[PDB]
């Protein structure tokens, strides 16, 4: 057809076009002139571009269509875009306890998942009833992420410079903080996950190891790895403000779940609150 | 002459690693020099 | 305040005519452009101390 021949004239024009256009933005030395002169913020490149796919992804995972690495992304995006940014962006170097505490939380957040696992076919959601899931008005969870944003700008802001806090043996208080945590949440997870037939139905009333300290001890741990990470940069005042914010907010949803599960079991969480009274903190709240 | 930047040369090396450099010639170094446009030098250790 | 500025732009356009002049060579360079001038020569005979 003789269309197909005009066509195929104006593509290979456009093509020709395009690819001169490329040759030379390439070839001219003076745009590698000025495009190298992009290379000093080769760290900020990624940082950022990565965001646009964590959120993405999160659009994505909203409507119901995520795979596993977009949804390992948007926590990924949450945890990196927590802990590494705000230090570079107020130092512009980043060397050492960032690294690690970035390290760190991706190792605590994956924790769900190997208990999940390993006691389970696999990371398919299972058929339950409607009203054993606690949720919590919206507005709430945002005001509990952005107030989590807040409390870790602030402490990459107050504290001191990475160089000039100390090392030797007070770096040893905060290794030992980071493992008792790790224990902590660990310990609580398997022995929550152990009493569930489905994914999250308890059968009976939990009372062994840090539930005879804690009433609630997943998210006290969760609370202390903040804690942990408000004392490595130094920064006692976001550790506060995250105390009265996470404390705000994870007390709401404590009252909402104890409620519901004295209501579903009755005597025996009653009487095994009345045996741990302290419900966030050891005999401090 | 007491400017801060007593020994602030080298370490900002080693913290900012992950920046980026470009090659400067050597005639232009020295007719650069030799009107005091210059108020860092850092050496490396091999003299390279 | 403009005659600052102006010598501000003149460093600033001889620097870049510098790292210009650098690309440049580096590009015209791989093309075999300068293949036989001084800044791509051939090799000969060598040459002793004397
Ligand atoms: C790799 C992960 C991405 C690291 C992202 C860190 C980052 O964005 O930091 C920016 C700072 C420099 O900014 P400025 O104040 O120098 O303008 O730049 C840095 O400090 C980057 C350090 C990059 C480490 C490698």
Redesign the pocket.
């Given at each position: 057809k003789p269309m197909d021949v005009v066509k195929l004239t104006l593509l290979l024009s456009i093509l020709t076009v395009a690819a001169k256009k490329t040759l030379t933005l390439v070839l001219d030395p003076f745009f590698w002139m000025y495009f190298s002169w992009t290379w000093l913020?080769w760290?900020?490149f990624?940082?950022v571009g990565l965001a646009g796919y964590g959120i993405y992804c999160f659009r994505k995972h909203w409507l119901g269509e995520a795979n596993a690495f977009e949804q390992l992304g948007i926590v990924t995006s949450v945890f990196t875009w927590l802990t590494?940014?705000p230090p570079?962006?107020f130092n512009?170097?980043?060397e050492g306890w960032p690294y690690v505490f970035f390290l760190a939380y991706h190792y605590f957040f994956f924790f769900n998942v190997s208990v999940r696992k390993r006691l389970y076919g696999d990371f398919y959601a299972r058929t339950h009833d409607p009203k054993w899931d606690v949720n919590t008005p919206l507005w709430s969870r945002i005001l509990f992420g952005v107030g989590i944003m807040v409390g870790h700008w602030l402490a990459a802001f107050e504290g001191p410079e990475l160089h000039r806090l100390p090392g030797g043996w007070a770096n040893v208080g905060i290794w030992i903080l980071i493992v008792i945590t790790m224990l902590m949440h660990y310990d609580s997870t398997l022995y929550l996950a152990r009493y569930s037939e489905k994914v999250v139905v308890p059968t009976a009333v939990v009372q062994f190891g840090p539930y005879r300290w804690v009433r609630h001890p997943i998210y006290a741990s969760t609370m202390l790895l903040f804690a942990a990470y408000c004392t490595a940069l130094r920064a006692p005042l976001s550790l506060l403000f995250l105390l009265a914010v996470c404390l705000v907010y994870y007390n709401k949803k404590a009252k909402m779940e104890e409620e519901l599960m004295v209501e579903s079991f009755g005597q025996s969480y009653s009487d095994y609150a009345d045996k741990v009274r302290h419900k966030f903190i050891p005999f401090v709240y | 002459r007491t400017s801060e930047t007593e020994g602030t040369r080298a370490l900002w090396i080693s913290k900012?690693w992950?920046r980026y450099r470009p090659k400067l010639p050597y005639t232009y170094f020295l007719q650069k020099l030799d009107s005091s446009e210059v108020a860092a030098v850092v050496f490396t250790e091999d003299l390279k | 305040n403009m005659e600052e500025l102006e010598r501000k732009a003149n460093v600033q356009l001889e620097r870049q005519l510098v790292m210009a002049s650098d690309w440049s060579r580096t590009l015209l360079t791989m093309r075999g452009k300068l293949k036989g001038t001084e800044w791509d020569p051939e090799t000969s005979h060598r040459i002793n101390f004397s």
């Amino acid at each position: 057809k003789p269309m197909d021949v005009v066509k195929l004239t104006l593509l290979l024009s456009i093509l020709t076009v395009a690819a001169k256009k490329t040759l030379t933005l390439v070839l001219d030395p003076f745009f590698w002139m000025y495009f190298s002169w992009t290379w000093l913020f080769w760290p900020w490149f990624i940082a950022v571009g990565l965001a646009g796919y964590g959120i993405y992804c999160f659009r994505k995972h909203w409507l119901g269509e995520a795979n596993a690495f977009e949804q390992l992304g948007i926590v990924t995006s949450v945890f990196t875009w927590l802990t590494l940014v705000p230090p570079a962006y107020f130092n512009g170097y980043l060397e050492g306890w960032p690294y690690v505490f970035f390290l760190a939380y991706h190792y605590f957040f994956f924790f769900n998942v190997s208990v999940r696992k390993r006691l389970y076919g696999d990371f398919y959601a299972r058929t339950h009833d409607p009203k054993w899931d606690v949720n919590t008005p919206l507005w709430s969870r945002i005001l509990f992420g952005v107030g989590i944003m807040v409390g870790h700008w602030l402490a990459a802001f107050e504290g001191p410079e990475l160089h000039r806090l100390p090392g030797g043996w007070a770096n040893v208080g905060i290794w030992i903080l980071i493992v008792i945590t790790m224990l902590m949440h660990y310990d609580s997870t398997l022995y929550l996950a152990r009493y569930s037939e489905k994914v999250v139905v308890p059968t009976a009333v939990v009372q062994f190891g840090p539930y005879r300290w804690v009433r609630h001890p997943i998210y006290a741990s969760t609370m202390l790895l903040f804690a942990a990470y408000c004392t490595a940069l130094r920064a006692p005042l976001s550790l506060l403000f995250l105390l009265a914010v996470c404390l705000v907010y994870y007390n709401k949803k404590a009252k909402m779940e104890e409620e519901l599960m004295v209501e579903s079991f009755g005597q025996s969480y009653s009487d095994y609150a009345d045996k741990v009274r302290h419900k966030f903190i050891p005999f401090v709240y | 002459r007491t400017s801060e930047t007593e020994g602030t040369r080298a370490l900002w090396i080693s913290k900012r690693w992950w920046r980026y450099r470009p090659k400067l010639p050597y005639t232009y170094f020295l007719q650069k020099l030799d009107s005091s446009e210059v108020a860092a030098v850092v050496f490396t250790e091999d003299l390279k | 305040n403009m005659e600052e500025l102006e010598r501000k732009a003149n460093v600033q356009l001889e620097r870049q005519l510098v790292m210009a002049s650098d690309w440049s060579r580096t590009l015209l360079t791989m093309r075999g452009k300068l293949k036989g001038t001084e800044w791509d020569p051939e090799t000969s005979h060598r040459i002793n101390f004397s």
